[PDB]
Design a protein around this motif. Structure first.
Motif, PDB file in Angstrom:
ATOM      1  N   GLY A   1       8.544  -0.429  -0.983  1.00 40.64           N
ATOM      2  CA  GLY A   1       7.775  -1.666  -0.856  1.00 40.64           C
ATOM      3  C   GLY A   1       6.764  -1.892  -1.962  1.00 40.64           C
TER       4      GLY A   1
ATOM      5  N   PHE B   1       5.297  -3.117  -5.796  1.00 42.77           N
ATOM      6  CA  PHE B   1       5.292  -4.391  -6.510  1.00 42.77           C
ATOM      7  C   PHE B   1       4.776  -4.243  -7.933  1.00 42.77           C
ATOM      8  CE2 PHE B   1       3.151  -8.384  -7.736  1.00 42.77           C
ATOM      9  CZ  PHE B   1       4.224  -9.259  -7.667  1.00 42.77           C
TER      10      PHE B   1
ATOM     11  N   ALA C   1       4.580  -6.387 -11.972  1.00 40.53           N
ATOM     12  CA  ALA C   1       4.748  -7.566 -12.831  1.00 40.53           C
ATOM     13  C   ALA C   1       3.946  -7.417 -14.122  1.00 40.53           C
ATOM     14  CB  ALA C   1       4.344  -8.840 -12.101  1.00 40.53           C
TER      15      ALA C   1
ATOM     16  N   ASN D   1       4.016   1.622  -1.480  1.00 40.63           N
ATOM     17  CA  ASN D   1       3.088   0.487  -1.375  1.00 40.63           C
ATOM     18  C   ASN D   1       2.234   0.261  -2.630  1.00 40.63           C
ATOM     19  OD1 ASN D   1       4.026   0.367   1.432  1.00 40.63           O
ATOM     20  ND2 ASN D   1       2.561   2.021   1.817  1.00 40.63           N
TER      21      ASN D   1
ATOM     22  N   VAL E   1       0.872  -1.215  -6.073  1.00 43.76           N
ATOM     23  CA  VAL E   1       0.740  -2.510  -6.721  1.00 43.76           C
ATOM     24  C   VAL E   1       0.291  -2.307  -8.170  1.00 43.76           C
ATOM     25  CG1 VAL E   1      -0.478  -4.735  -6.705  1.00 43.76           C
ATOM     26  CG2 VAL E   1       0.194  -3.668  -4.543  1.00 43.76           C
TER      27      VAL E   1
ATOM     28  N   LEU F   1      -0.137  -4.478 -11.603  1.00 40.96           N
ATOM     29  CA  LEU F   1      -0.184  -5.833 -12.134  1.00 40.96           C
ATOM     30  C   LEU F   1      -0.819  -5.875 -13.528  1.00 40.96           C
ATOM     31  CD1 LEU F   1       0.562  -8.637 -11.791  1.00 40.96           C
ATOM     32  CD2 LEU F   1      -0.875  -8.772  -9.740  1.00 40.96           C
TER      33      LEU F   1
ATOM     34  N   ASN G   1      -0.371   4.558  -1.799  1.00 40.95           N
ATOM     35  CA  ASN G   1      -1.270   3.478  -1.396  1.00 40.95           C
ATOM     36  C   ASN G   1      -2.387   3.217  -2.403  1.00 40.95           C
ATOM     37  OD1 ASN G   1       0.025   2.964   1.261  1.00 40.95           O
ATOM     38  ND2 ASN G   1      -0.761   5.013   1.736  1.00 40.95           N
TER      39      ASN G   1
ATOM     40  N   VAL H   1      -3.635   0.873  -6.079  1.00 35.12           N
ATOM     41  CA  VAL H   1      -3.523  -0.420  -6.743  1.00 35.12           C
ATOM     42  C   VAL H   1      -4.161  -0.336  -8.125  1.00 35.12           C
ATOM     43  CG1 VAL H   1      -4.160  -2.867  -6.664  1.00 35.12           C
ATOM     44  CG2 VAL H   1      -3.603  -1.684  -4.546  1.00 35.12           C
TER      45      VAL H   1
ATOM     46  N   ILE I   1      -4.778  -3.178 -11.214  1.00 32.10           N
ATOM     47  CA  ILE I   1      -4.662  -4.518 -11.767  1.00 32.10           C
ATOM     48  C   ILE I   1      -5.464  -4.578 -13.063  1.00 32.10           C
ATOM     49  CG2 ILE I   1      -5.118  -6.981 -11.408  1.00 32.10           C
ATOM     50  CD1 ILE I   1      -4.866  -6.249  -8.291  1.00 32.10           C
TER      51      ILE I   1
ATOM     52  N   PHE J   1      -8.193   2.403  -6.142  1.00 33.00           N
ATOM     53  CA  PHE J   1      -8.111   0.988  -6.471  1.00 33.00           C
ATOM     54  C   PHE J   1      -8.770   0.694  -7.807  1.00 33.00           C
ATOM     55  CE2 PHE J   1      -7.826   1.561  -1.944  1.00 33.00           C
ATOM     56  CZ  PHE J   1      -6.738   0.776  -1.590  1.00 33.00           C
TER      57      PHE J   1
END
Lengths: 292, 292, 292
Positions: free
Chosen positions: A152, A154, A156, A166, A168, A170, A180, A182, A184, A198
């Protein structure tokens, strides 16, 4: 004698209710399969479809190749819109078009672009170039050279790795291999065994970031949490601090050593023995005033 | 005499192994091209394909138009699934369907929707309405009226501009024209020459945000970094502050003048002459206790 | 006598310039419609197209079904690339392929995958499994079991709900039902009537988060804003605090009770009676030094 083959001397049919619209060197097998025309197209199995083009192979039940060249739709309900050298070999797999794309498992999709791989179940690569989604339910929205191996996950932008569950990632060069987490921004790394981290920032240093850390900003570095129950200033001891947490939660970082950041527009926090509210300059001033 | 054209009086073939399944006013040229039927379809070049529909033009080698009307697949390995007035004129370009979409460069993709433009190399617009991805490796996930002119930029939602390199604009009315910046939320602007700025918030004021600034929250304003080595309170001077950074890193902002925010659940920070840890209310209280 | 139907005893034509390439039990109606072959395909209306496969229905003007089985393209300029049981019934709607997908309104798109629903105008589901985009201009990038019912909302990953206007839900189990809010990470909830809330974190507790709150990190809890103009420490009063905001802005939270986080690498803030800059440990130390 239920087949309608026409066009070339080398168009062959081996089954029932097959159709070849024209062209030459097209093969059909099975039942109710169709080739509109073109060159060296193979439509085998039941209810497969080749629009036209060249060297396309629609084996597998209810396969579809719209056109283009050297495409291979294998397995049930595969679809290749068109393009060059696309391979849809998962059940219900889809490739919109483009070149050298692969949709290999159940419900995987490639919108288009070049050298994209949807290898996870329910995985999606919308487009772009050289993107690889391997995790179950993983997504690459677009861009170039992304990876989404996490369940799951993601990704880009350019050169991201959403490679833990999970995850992310970006922007540009975000690498996530901790659960878990992230990232960005740009140039961020969360290694395996760094969980729940994070990052909204760029060029971060995560060497010393523990689990649960938050990193904000350009050039921000992680820091190990320290327990601070009390302090001593030249014989004077200050005891009873709140928020001297036993657990290793990590720390929210806003800069690095030598490149610290001010935190501005901070409301006045509670001043009590249990208060874990942050303190602003006017509050420290207030006390300093009395020290006159 | 290698062609299989049938159906109408005005179906014309000009080449080898061409096929027209039926309809009328369909033209074929080149070699191994196919039109399933319909009206006023043109399939020229080698190995091109038109399923059917009307007024479609598959020029270009290995082109494919599935159906619909007024579509134009030009250039090698183009694909248009169907729809109204779509133009795929890039190499390996793809348009799933929809209306008035354009995929104009190598490996560009438009999933569907209306008035979408994938004009960058390896650019992707998954769907939505009036989205324009112009940068190399740029992505618009979906929504309405987005722009992604930046190299490897990413945009989604309504009215975003990911218009600088590696720009991430997520939500509603995020405008990014400064390098390596991120805006997530609503009504945020990062102007050209504001680099490395990160916004997780809405309705921010970025007039005074320097490079490296982080803005958090609704109505949050940027602020210029100030060097604070020391302070003076009524004849009493306090010297030797840590984190009085010479560099212009910008400042982490959590509100604006008149609408400041408390920062809560802050752990007790180190109290030493080199300490750049934030201070909580219990720590200030501790000192105030002694001032009795 | 303008129709070209061939192949089976049960292929029927009812109109002008219709074509059936072969197979059996195929129906055509209207004008200029085409079925390449296959079994039990219905192409009605003007300029519709079925490549082949079985039990496909291209009613609606300029419809296209590339192939596969049990697909239904209804309404103007619909496109189904292929797959199993897909329904494109919106104007200019698109389904790349996959199984049991629905694109039901103007300009809606489904890239592929399984059980995906693009029900909003200009809505997009790129792929994945069981994703439902209902809002105007809503987007689901991919993943499994996402919802995007908000106007211009965006969701990706597993089990997210971008279910308010301009909502951004990224990662795993982010639920947003409050206006202009963002949740990135895992297990986060923004309820209806909690507006302008931003979460970059996981497993947050948003029971007590007011409008405008920002939550950072794993296990972080929201907290109600308190007005703090002054404080009293054993008979000594400290008055004139800046940032004692009358408005309910909410608070930036970095942890929860018992699991507080240190904020590190904080630059020295202004020490004045109007200063809302955060204070670091070296600044508090500086004052404590004098208290010797």
């Amino acid at each position: 004698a239920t087949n309608k083959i026409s066009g070339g001397d080398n168009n062959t049919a081996n089954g029932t209710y097959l159709t070849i619209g024209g062209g030459d060197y097209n093969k059909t097998k099975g039942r109710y399969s169709t080739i509109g025309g073109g060159l060296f197209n193979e439509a085998t199995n039941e209810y497969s479809t080749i629009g036209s083009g060249g060297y396309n192979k629609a084996k597998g039940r209810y396969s579809t190749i719209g056109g283009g060249g050297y495409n291979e739709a294998t397995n049930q309900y595969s679809t290749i819109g068109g393009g060059d050298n696309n391979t849809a070999k998962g059940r219900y797999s889809t490739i919109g078009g483009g070149g050298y794309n692969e949709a290999t498992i159940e419900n995987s999709t490639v919108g288009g672009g070049g050298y994209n791989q949807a290898k996870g179940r329910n995985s999606t690569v919308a487009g772009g170039y050289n993107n690889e989604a391997t995790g179950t339910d993983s997504t690459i929205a677009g861009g170039r050279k992304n990876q989404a191996t996490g369940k799951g996950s993601f990704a880009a932008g350019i050169d991201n790795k959403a490679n833990a569950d999970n995850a992310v990632a970006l922007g540009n060069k975000n690498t996530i291999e901790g659960e878990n987490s992230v990232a960005i921004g740009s140039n961020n790394t969360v290694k395996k065994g760094q969980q729940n981290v994070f990052i909204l920032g760029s060029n971060t240093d995560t060497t010393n970031a523990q689990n649960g850390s938050v990193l904000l900003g350009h050039n921000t570095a992680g820091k190990a949490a320290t327990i601070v129950n009390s302090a001593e200033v030249g014989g004077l001891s200050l005891t009873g601090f709140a928020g001297a947490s036993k657990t290793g939660n990590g720390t929210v970082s806003v800069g690095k050593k030598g490149k610290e950041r001010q935190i501005v527009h901070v409301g006045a926090g509670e001043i009590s023995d249990t208060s874990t509210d942050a303190v602003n300059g006017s509050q420290l001033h207030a006390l300093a005033t009395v020290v006159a």
